[PDB]
Amino acid sequence: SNAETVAAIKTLIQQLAQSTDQFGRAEINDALRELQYSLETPFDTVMRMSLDTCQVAVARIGSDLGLFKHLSQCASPQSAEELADHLGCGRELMSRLLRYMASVRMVQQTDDIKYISSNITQTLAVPGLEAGMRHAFENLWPVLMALPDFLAERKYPDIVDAKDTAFQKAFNTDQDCFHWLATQPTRIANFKVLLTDERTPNFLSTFPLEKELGSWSAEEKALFVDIGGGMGHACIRLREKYPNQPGRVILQDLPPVLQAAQATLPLSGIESMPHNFHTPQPVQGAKFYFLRLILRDFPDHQALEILQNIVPAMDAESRIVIDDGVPPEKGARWAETGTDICIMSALGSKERTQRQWEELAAKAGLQLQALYQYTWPVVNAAMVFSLQ
Amino acid sequence: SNAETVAAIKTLIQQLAQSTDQFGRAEINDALRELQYSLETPFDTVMRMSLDTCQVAVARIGSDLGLFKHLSQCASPQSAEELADHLGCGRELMSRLLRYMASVRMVQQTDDIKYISSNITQTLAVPGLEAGMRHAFENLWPVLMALPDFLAERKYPDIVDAKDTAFQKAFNTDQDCFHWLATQPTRIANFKVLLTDERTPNFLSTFPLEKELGSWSAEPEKALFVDIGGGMGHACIRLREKYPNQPGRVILQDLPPVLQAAQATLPLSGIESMPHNFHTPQPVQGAKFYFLRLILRDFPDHQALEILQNIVPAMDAESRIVIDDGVPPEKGARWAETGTDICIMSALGSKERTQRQWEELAAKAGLQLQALYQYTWPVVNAAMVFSLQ
Amino acid sequence: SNAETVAAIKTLIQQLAQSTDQFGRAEINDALRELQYSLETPFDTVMRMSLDTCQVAVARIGSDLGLFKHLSQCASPQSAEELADHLGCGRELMSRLLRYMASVRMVQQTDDIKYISSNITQTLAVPGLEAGMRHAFENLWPVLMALPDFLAERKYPDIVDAKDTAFQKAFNTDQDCFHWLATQPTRIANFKVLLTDERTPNFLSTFPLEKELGSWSAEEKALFVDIGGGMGHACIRLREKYPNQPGRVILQDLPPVLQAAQATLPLSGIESMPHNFHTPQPVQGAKFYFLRLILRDFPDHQALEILQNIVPAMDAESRIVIDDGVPPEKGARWAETGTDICIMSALGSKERTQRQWEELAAKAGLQLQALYQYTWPVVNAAMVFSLQ
Amino acid sequence: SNAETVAAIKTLIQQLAQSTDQFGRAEINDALRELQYSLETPFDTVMRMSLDTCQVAVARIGSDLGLFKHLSQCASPQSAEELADHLGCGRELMSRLLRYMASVRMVQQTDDIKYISSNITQTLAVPGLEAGMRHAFENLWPVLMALPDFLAERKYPDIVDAKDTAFQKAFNTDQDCFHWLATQPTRIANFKVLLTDERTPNFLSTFPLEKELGSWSAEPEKALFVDIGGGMGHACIRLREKYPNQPGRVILQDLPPVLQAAQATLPLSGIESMPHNFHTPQPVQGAKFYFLRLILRDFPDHQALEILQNIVPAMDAESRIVIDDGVPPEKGARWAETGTDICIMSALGSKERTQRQWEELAAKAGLQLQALYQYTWPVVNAAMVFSLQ
Numbered sequence A, C: 001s002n003a004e005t006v007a008a009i010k011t012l013i014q015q016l017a018q019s020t021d022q023f024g025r026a027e028i029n030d031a032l033r034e035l036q037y038s039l040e041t042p043f044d045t046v047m048r049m050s051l052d053t054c055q056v057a058v059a060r061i062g063s064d065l066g067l068f069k070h071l072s073q074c075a076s077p078q079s080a081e082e083l084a085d086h087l088g089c090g091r092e093l094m095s096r097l098l099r100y101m102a103s104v105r106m107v108q109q110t111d112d113i114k115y116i117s118s119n120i121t122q123t124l125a126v127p128g129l130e131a132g133m134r135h136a137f138e139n140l141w142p143v144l145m146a147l148p149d150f151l152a153e154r155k156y157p158d159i160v161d162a163k164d165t166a167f168q169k170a171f172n173t174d175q176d177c178f179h180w181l182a183t184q185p186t187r188i189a190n191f192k193v194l195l196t197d198e199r200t201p202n203f204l205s206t207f208p209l210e211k212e213l214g215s216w217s218a219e220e221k222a223l224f225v226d227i228g229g230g231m232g233h234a235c236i237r238l239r240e241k242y243p244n245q246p247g248r249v250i251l252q253d254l255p256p257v258l259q260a261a262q263a264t265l266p267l268s269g270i271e272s273m274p275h276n277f278h279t280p281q282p283v284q285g286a287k288f289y290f291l292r293l294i295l296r297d298f299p300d301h302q303a304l305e306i307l308q309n310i311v312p313a314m315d316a317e318s319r320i321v322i323d324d325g326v327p328p329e330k331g332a333r334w335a336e337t338g339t340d341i342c343i344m345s346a347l348g349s350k351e352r353t354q355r356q357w358e359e360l361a362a363k364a365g366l367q368l369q370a371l372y373q374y375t376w377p378v379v380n381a382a383m384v385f386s387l388q
Numbered sequence B, D: 001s002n003a004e005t006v007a008a009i010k011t012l013i014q015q016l017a018q019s020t021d022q023f024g025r026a027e028i029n030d031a032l033r034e035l036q037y038s039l040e041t042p043f044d045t046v047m048r049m050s051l052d053t054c055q056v057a058v059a060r061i062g063s064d065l066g067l068f069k070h071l072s073q074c075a076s077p078q079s080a081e082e083l084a085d086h087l088g089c090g091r092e093l094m095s096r097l098l099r100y101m102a103s104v105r106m107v108q109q110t111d112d113i114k115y116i117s118s119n120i121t122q123t124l125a126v127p128g129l130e131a132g133m134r135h136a137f138e139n140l141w142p143v144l145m146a147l148p149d150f151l152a153e154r155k156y157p158d159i160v161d162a163k164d165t166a167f168q169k170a171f172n173t174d175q176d177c178f179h180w181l182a183t184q185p186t187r188i189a190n191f192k193v194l195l196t197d198e199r200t201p202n203f204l205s206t207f208p209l210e211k212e213l214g215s216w217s218a219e220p221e222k223a224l225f226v227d228i229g230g231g232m233g234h235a236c237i238r239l240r241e242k243y244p245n246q247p248g249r250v251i252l253q254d255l256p257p258v259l260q261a262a263q264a265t266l267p268l269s270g271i272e273s274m275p276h277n278f279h280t281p282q283p284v285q286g287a288k289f290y291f292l293r294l295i296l297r298d299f300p301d302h303q304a305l306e307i308l309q310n311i312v313p314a315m316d317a318e319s320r321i322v323i324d325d326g327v328p329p330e331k332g333a334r335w336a337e338t339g340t341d342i343c344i345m346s347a348l349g350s351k352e353r354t355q356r357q358w359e360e361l362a363a364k365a366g367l368q369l370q371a372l373y374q375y376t377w378p379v380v381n382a383a384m385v386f387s388l389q
């Protein structure tokens, strides 16, 4: 029987998944995806590509109704009629959105056709993760919608400029993405919440801090300068893991982001210093200048500018630590290639190989000293650079 | 070891998939999908939803370039710069597109960083299937993009009319979808190619034709099979092919432009081409089977009822209306049948219908269900046989 | 849960087994055995070796009670008390033998503690297969019981003689096994039934008869001489598969075996000719002289004698076809190595590699022309030999 | 492909076995065994039953030669002729034995036709485990070989007496097994080594000692634990090791020859050695736990009852008899607990007992079951706690 076979497959894959770590589970999940694609019929492939786009449209509707937050707090299964009446939604519309949501595990449907939270329901109720989904709907989707015609119009160029990519046609403007976003109040607020989403694991899981420090002394220097550090999660985790390391630990960002960070920052030990990383770096001779998920959002020439603003502040002991994606030369996975297409369409930037990172840093007069990977199989690493 | 466990999982699923039929493989594929969603991390969920949308956009770029057709014809792996130079694409952009494509199996990357066709490559090179991908990008995507704020602005109504749903907001018009497409020279040609993609399997694989014929005579000159809105007439062709000795007229009904397009692929005899708008009374009297495949799902109840009412006065006691369409279950419906429901709600104002909802609709037309013959699994397509009440 | 895991393993292995042929199932079964051995604890290994010997002792008890034949014909589950009363067995003894039998699948026990036939029950009810089990108990077991002390007494020799191996000590006689068996009425009868067990598949599944024949003509020669052919299954299958091939087809065996074969032989087309294969072969110039599972039961010197009795009867077109086990040089499996130990202990003989077969046939002046394997992964093959 | 499917099965089972505990692995192993029996052909069944008996005989030969101990010590693979020449075995015979051994994993054959130790090699080199294999060959095998014709000759009786079962026919004597072994200089030494094999896990892994102590005082000088027929005293050693601070005498009771043999391995203090035949009244009064591990299963009901009756008059209200033994289920019992039942029936006239049969036996001694603490799965061994009625 196929239902018996299918239940047995689920049981054994679940038992294998439970017995490995999060990296082994990510590898199993990538293999399940590749098996699905290789096994589908030609018609299934067209259907899958046609319909998987429903997921984020329906998630955005659930978010606007407050459905995922509400269902996450319910202690018992809820009927479609109870959800519809509580949330201000038409009853037949609510019933057919829940039926779609249950079919892709956005919620769970019970045997008596009621609804409970799934793991995905809990995810979409988290503010930072909800904001990532809403960001995909309102900012990424229109740009991907414009990419095919944009490339055809321009005879398939190598996109290298943030001010002439798919973004400009999608939103009918000559501004680049980041500047245009800063003039849109509702989108600014959503990105503010997006910053509260802390990625796990982080670089401190594999970064050999003591061996990189060596005999460095804080005789009143900065140990860690978090450039564009957002909520300062890197500073918070650093002070939490090495609470007796001397040296200033400084969060650098724009004033509005720094204000939103004050609530969750510790009252002691981490300075909030407003700084635009398109300007010369004010902190001189720091041990670590840290750039996490910054340079991936800029083309080569402006990513170079950012590093050139830091280099004149470095001493011989100073290091620029680039914490970012490092996809492989071969066999890159969908999370790191889909990234690449999205940031080319919206920002004109790109993901870069280890060899691509080294070539960019050499234009700044830097040399790679060490690379400390901390996620698998999609590669994120802390890359430590020195003066040439 | 982690690599060897992954490779062992792949080998065992492959072997199990090879050990069953297409319905068993579709069930396995749905199970693998369920497993993925249940095992992803919270961040993976958001990433998956953010990035899976790239597949349709990049497929449209590859279709614009003719990449899929070209690589399908290739006998040896090709480098990114060979592909770029041949198709007229920037070398950097081509390498980035191929890397993404390979990551989602839209093509395959070899150990030497060259590229081969995959099953998906082959699929996207087929014109009828290519056209469904292009239809989803240019027609379905804008409607889904407009749906959330349409529902918000309108305070989440129950959509029931084809001229007031998300489609009107998405394309800034007041026509319904089918009217509007007819006035669009840009998009009609793709819809015409879409009719050429014959779905497999079809209802004849399980339809007990001889049993359903029962006490019915083709004499003197009666119609066996009237295929209402039959498009290219696939149903008529497969019917004559499977039952070449059964007497009776076999009639393809559609609009004159579609019938003209069907002439190239119809047999020279045995199948009549009859122009007929199914919003008017059915002209063929007393046929055995009045056949409607994937017609009624595109209409709200009121218009779907009128289409059935156009047929009923032509029926004799031994006539049957055969509705060949999706029949999702009361619970546990699959993503392919719920996804379609959202899409046709947003574009057409219509809906998928359960067996009970089909019977309720047909009751208003004075019909009763005599039999239901499923022919796909686990997503249910079925030939439903209705008679006069 | 372990019961859910264990049920899922069963489901998936069963589905894989159903989807291959009998050779793939044999390979899966060998892998399950090797996995069991590698996974057991040290205590499990001693227990397994201690207790798996119960299986054939309890099978012999079930055979003597007629239990397997009786249960094979029952249309409903039977209680231990009903089986005990019907078969003339003590009720508590019957209950604990059935509990042991059910634990090793010799029968199946139901949820309400009744008993039904298993696949193994049906097997043990077949006369020829029952006789194989009874043969293992009464003839093989005592010889294996004597092998360790026999080898120690004699300082671990290379056993090469049928008249001085473990058999002589086990049954306290100086006769060789076959001669001693012929003086034991009850054992003669059991081997008579053992001959009715036809092995499947057989050599005709892969033997290219027409291409081996070539232009041979029966102008009034024998096509097939089945030497020690037993019930003549090889002759029956040959006439059934090639019913229009001209040439005599002759079953050669001892008179008592030939009598028992007459019942099941066709009335036409197969001659029954009494012949002792330790004597010169009477049929001259036949196309195929066929020896299936004969030479494995003799040491080299008497296996050579048997072939030397046939060679002077051959023409240039004649072939000796040895149908027997051909184990590999490396990675031989338990069915073909356990064989080897048993026949060395009882008969002084051995299994032989392809290279070992060629060297034996060369002493007879024969050369291997072709080898047609027909079972996997345990190798049985029809080996075709020509005059040197 | 058939090879790759086999290799994938092996990898997945290995990974599942590694992903659970020893009890999960024992369940997996029983499942693999069930699968094999259900998937074998009729001819395979007969072959398996014919040939699996070779394993014990060949293990005994390897033990006689010291093969398992030698290969266990070896740092590199060894050829058959190196092994033959070193152990004093004919080169032909050695190669044939090793080929068979490798086929059942008793050692492993390398790709270059050389031989390494396996887990089973290691096992058979351990003296206590070696001794169980030798015991099965020389003591159990002759009794099983005599059982069928013994039952036939005697018209299939219910065996209930230790001096009239298959053992008397197998060894042509009228003594019971335990008496007869004591008069056999050949076989006593192996039985002595058998006592040194400590089973794992043991009852202390789940026994809630502090809970069972309850309202009981070691003062003034009471006994915590009396291990009746305790052999080498493993139970006493592990008890003092796990509960080093719990007060009370810990007493090992056995026959003087076994106690002498236990002296080498006992701690210098904390455990008393008390000669005592458990067929006589128990001398230690008012102990908390009177412990009987794998004692009573070797006796028919009548003698097992007498052993319990020897203990009851020594008990106080807070005293408990702890029977540590096998407790097979009412249905679905495993081969390791049913196989033992046949073996001890044939040699000792005794039996395995379900929980209900244990309670019935103890009721005749005036005892009631207070608690049962299982410590192995799926084959059930349990510490059963009995109190006065």
Ligand SMILES: C[S@@+](CC[C@H](N)C(=O)[O-])C[C@H]1O[C@@H](n2cnc3c(N)ncnc32)[C@H](O)[C@@H]1O
Binding pocket: A195, A227, A228, A229, A230, A231, A232, A233, A252, A253, A254, A257, A275, A276, A277, A278, A291, A292, A293, A294
């Ligand atoms: C990827 S987000 C947060 C990255 C941060 N390193 C982390 O891992 O959480 C990029 C950050 O850069 C900040 N940013 C953007 N433009 C900036 C600028 N010109 N100067 C300083 N920070 C800027 C944003 O406020 C945002 O917090």
Ligand SMILES: C[S@@+](CC[C@H](N)C(=O)[O-])C[C@H]1O[C@@H](n2cnc3c(N)ncnc32)[C@H](O)[C@@H]1O
Binding pocket: B195, B228, B229, B230, B231, B232, B233, B234, B253, B254, B255, B258, B276, B277, B278, B279, B292, B293, B294, B295
């Ligand atoms: C889903 S498509 C083809 C369905 C077809 N039965 C099949 O299974 O291939 C719907 C068909 O209905 C036709 N159609 C649309 N409106 C129609 C009308 N008013 N009268 C007749 N046919 C119509 C279209 O031309 C198209 O061929």
Ligand SMILES: C[S@@+](CC[C@H](N)C(=O)[O-])C[C@H]1O[C@@H](n2cnc3c(N)ncnc32)[C@H](O)[C@@H]1O
Binding pocket: C195, C227, C228, C229, C230, C231, C232, C233, C252, C253, C254, C257, C275, C276, C277, C278, C291, C292, C293, C294
């Ligand atoms: C392995 S059994 C049957 C083999 C037979 N080729 C088959 O495949 O069924 C061996 C046969 O050889 C026969 N046999 C034993 N000694 C013989 C002899 N001296 N002359 C002729 N046949 C003999 C026995 O009667 C028995 O039928």
Ligand SMILES: C[S@@+](CC[C@H](N)C(=O)[O-])C[C@H]1O[C@@H](n2cnc3c(N)ncnc32)[C@H](O)[C@@H]1O
Binding pocket: D195, D228, D229, D230, D231, D232, D233, D234, D253, D254, D255, D258, D276, D277, D278, D279, D292, D293, D294, D295
């Ligand atoms: C199964 S062995 C050892 C059991 C021990 N409780 C254990 O778990 O290791 C049985 C023990 O009972 C002892 N024994 C046999 N007869 C006895 C008797 N009459 N009185 C006391 N001990 C006896 C033997 O010496 C042997 O040590």
Ligand SMILES: [Cl-]
Binding pocket: B242, B243, B244, B245, B246
């Ligand atoms: Cl026909």
Ligand SMILES: [Cl-]
Binding pocket: D242, D243, D244, D245, D246
């Ligand atoms: Cl303690």
